[PDB]
Amino acid sequence: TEFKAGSAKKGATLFKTRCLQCHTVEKGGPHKVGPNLHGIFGRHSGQAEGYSYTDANIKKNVLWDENNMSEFLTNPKKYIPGTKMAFGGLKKEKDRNDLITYLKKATE
């Protein structure tokens, strides 16, 4: 167990300032640069259709669990070299933890 639930709220504001530019959470939500994250958890990587992931991403074949999501969140490229996703990553866990809190609710 290496994830403590946080502020859904704060997670929610971190997403906008940080993943909105390229993602949408809404079920019925459209893809933009990155894909629509509706129902990511318990889901493997490179699987939203209508979406063109790198070969890197497909291959990775990560199961989207709260805990995976933190590691990837840490440093994307380092987690999945090849991914087109342009994101440096959230160094602090507190931050990481909050947003995962956000995704958890919102992606349900």
Ligand code: HEC
């Ligand atoms: C545009 C500058 C992006 C921002 C900001 C964030 N992400 Fe992203 N994301 C982007 C791309 C181009 C892709 C696909 C990469 C590929 O190589 O095809 C992604 C993908 C993801 C995934 C994985 C998806 C899966 O297997 O279904 C996740 C979980 C994800 N993105 C989440 C995410 C979050 C939470 C972000 C803010 C903290 C974020 N991304 C930023 C592009 C961009």
